[PDB]
Amino acid sequence: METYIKLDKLGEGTYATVYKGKSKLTDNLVALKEIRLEHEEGAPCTAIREVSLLKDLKHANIVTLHDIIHTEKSLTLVFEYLDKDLKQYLDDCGNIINMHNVKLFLFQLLRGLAYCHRQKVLHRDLKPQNLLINERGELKLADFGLARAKTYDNEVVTLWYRPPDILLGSTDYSTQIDMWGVGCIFYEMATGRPLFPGSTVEEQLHFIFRILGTPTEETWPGILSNEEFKTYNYPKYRAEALLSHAPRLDSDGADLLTKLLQFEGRNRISAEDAMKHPFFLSLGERIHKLPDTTSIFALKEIQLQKEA
Ligand SMILES: CNC(=O)c1cc(Oc2ccc(NC(=O)Nc3cc(C(C)(C)C)nn3-c3ccc4ncccc4c3)c(F)c2)ccn1
C-alpha cells in the first residue's frame, strides 16, 4: 500500500544502491536501499539479518527502518531520511561546528552506542559517514556497510578510526573498540579535521604514536613482548597534549578525549560512563533519564544553536 519514488542516488555498493526518496502516502523523505535479487535466493541472508537487527533495536539515536518492499527482482529497505552526514555537516560549516552542537552530537552518539553495547552490538566501523544528522539536530548511528557514498567524496578512511591495540593483534574484540572511534570522531567534530588519517596499519599506528607518544611497559604492560610491535620498530615519541591540537575543547572535553583514547580497550571510558562525564554537566540532569526512544530535543533546554 505505501509506495515510494526515487529522487537521487545517496550511495552505491556491489549488491545494493541507496536512493534518496519520498513516500507518496506521507510526503516524508526516505532512504531506499534496494538490494538486487540476482540469484534465486528469496531474500539474501545479509538483508534478513540487517532487517532482524534493525527491528530489534529501538533507539532515538539509531537510524529507523520504516518499511520493507519485496518484488520478484528486488528487496528494498526503507529508512527515514536524515538531511546530512557528519562530514557533509562539517563541510557546510567550513569545518567549524558550534561547540554546543558538538556536545549534543557527541552525547547522542554515546547514547546510541550505549544502547548498542547493552544489546551486545559492537558497531566496529564508526566514522563520520555513519553519523546522520537531521534539520532538528538529531544524530543517528548507521552502518552503510559497503555503499560507497555518491571534495571529501571517496576518501579512503578504512583505518582512521581503528584502535592501536587491535592493529597490533589483540584478540579482545569488545565494545571498547568503538570507544576509540568515538574519541577520533570527537576530535574531528572539535577541529573539523581527522585525528589519525593513516594509509596503512604501520602508518596508522605511527600517526597515533606521534600524538599519544610511543608506548612502554609503563603505558602498555607487556608491549615489548609483542612480536608485531617488536618488528614495527618506532622511535620513542614524547606525548603532545591534546588540548593544544584542539583549542576548542575545554579542559573537561580534553579530559574526556584522553579517557577515550587509551591504547588498550580494557582501560577506555565506556559509553555509559562517558555520558556521566562533567563535559556534559551543562546539559542537565533530565537528559540522563530519557527513554531510549525519546529525542534529546524533547527537553526544550536542549536546542540546536544556529550554525554560521
Ligand atoms: C544524507 N542522508 C543519507 O545519506 C541517508 C541515508 C540513509 O540510508 C541508509 C541508512 C542506514 C542503512 N542501514 C543501516 O544503518 N544498517 C545498520 C545499522 C546498524 C547499527 C544498529 C549497528 C548501527 N547495523 N546495520 C547493519 C546491520 C547488518 C548489516 N548486514 C549487512 C550489511 C549491512 C548491515 C548494516 C541503510 F541501509 C540505508 C538513511 C538516511 N539518510
Side-chain angles (χ1 to χ4, degrees), residues 1-14 16-35 37 40 42-57 59-71 74-134 137-149 151-209 211-217 219-224 226 228-229 231-235 237 239-265 267-288 290-299 301-305 307-308:
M1 172 55 211
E2 191 176 12
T3 53
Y4 306 94
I5 53 172
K6 301 154 164 188
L7 304 173
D8 209 339
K9 196 167 274 172
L10 292 169
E12 199 155 26
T14 292
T17 303
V18 179
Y19 305 98
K20 181 190 179 187
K22 197 189 188 205
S23 169
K24 300 181 181 181
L25 179 68
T26 55
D27 279 308
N28 296 341
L29 295 185
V30 291
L32 299 167
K33 175 159 95 166
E34 188 184 311
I35 300 154
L37 303 176
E40 303 299 310
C45 297
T46 53
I48 291 167
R49 180 154 289 166
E50 186 169 14
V51 169
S52 67
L53 193 73
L54 286 151
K55 266 183 152 80
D56 294 350
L57 304 180
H59 198 270
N61 306 117
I62 292 168
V63 293
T64 297
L65 183 70
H66 179 68
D67 201 3
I68 307 128
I69 314 170
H70 190 106
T71 78
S74 64
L75 177 65
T76 299
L77 278 53
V78 184
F79 291 91
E80 324 177 325
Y81 183 73
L82 290 87
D83 298 81
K84 308 194 193 153
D85 70 52
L86 176 55
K87 196 72 191 179
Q88 288 158 216
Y89 194 101
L90 282 166
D91 208 66
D92 293 5
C93 309
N95 294 284
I96 299 299
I97 295 166
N98 212 92
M99 273 305 295
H100 172 81
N101 295 346
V102 165
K103 189 171 290 203
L104 299 183
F105 296 147
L106 186 63
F107 195 82
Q108 295 179 82
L109 173 60
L110 290 164
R111 208 159 67 112
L113 283 176
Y115 180 85
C116 285
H117 296 165
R118 288 203 330 274
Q119 309 313 121
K120 305 171 201 284
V121 184
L122 172 65
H123 194 282
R124 114 231 89 119
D125 198 32
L126 291 176
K127 52 178 189 214
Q129 196 213 323
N130 280 336
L131 307 190
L132 299 164
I133 299 171
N134 62 22
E138 300 176 328
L139 178 144
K140 303 189 185 212
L141 281 167
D143 184 3
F144 281 104
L146 175 29
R148 153 225 176 284
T151 79
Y152 55 77
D153 266 300
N154 303 314
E155 291 193 312
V156 180
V157 302
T158 309
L159 306 155
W160 294 13
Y161 307 100
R162 195 61 84 82
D165 55 335
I166 299 301
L167 298 173
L168 291 168
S170 172
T171 81
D172 185 17
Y173 287 61
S174 74
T175 47
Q176 300 295 74
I177 286 160
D178 291 338
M179 300 323 299
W180 174 275
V182 168
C184 297
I185 299 299
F186 186 16
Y187 183 98
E188 190 160 351
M189 290 191 289
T191 63
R193 41 178 174 73
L195 181 48
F196 300 135
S199 288
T200 71
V201 169
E202 188 185 348
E203 198 206 15
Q204 187 61 32
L205 283 171
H206 183 248
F207 274 132
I208 289 166
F209 298 148
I211 307 298
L212 277 75
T214 308
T216 76
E217 298 291 325
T219 57
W220 196 333
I223 189 55
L224 299 156
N226 189 321
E228 305 184 58
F229 179 63
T231 314
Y232 293 127
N233 207 82
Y234 295 106
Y237 279 98
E240 284 187 284
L242 295 170
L243 188 38
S244 64
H245 296 283
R248 306 182 72 220
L249 301 180
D250 57 353
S251 105
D252 284 341
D255 176 65
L256 176 54
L257 187 58
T258 302
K259 290 173 169 157
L260 295 163
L261 301 174
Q262 298 297 112
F263 290 133
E264 300 165 61
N267 302 325
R268 293 180 193 125
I269 194 168
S270 66
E272 294 190 5
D273 291 335
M275 282 181 294
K276 295 158 177 151
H277 195 271
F279 186 62
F280 299 114
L281 208 72
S282 87
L283 310 178
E285 287 173 274
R286 294 217 297 163
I287 205 169
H288 290 92
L290 285 176
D292 284 336
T293 43
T294 302
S295 179
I296 65 159
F297 295 90
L299 295 175
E301 82 259 30
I302 297 296
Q303 290 182 255
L304 198 66
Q305 299 262 31
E307 218 61 76

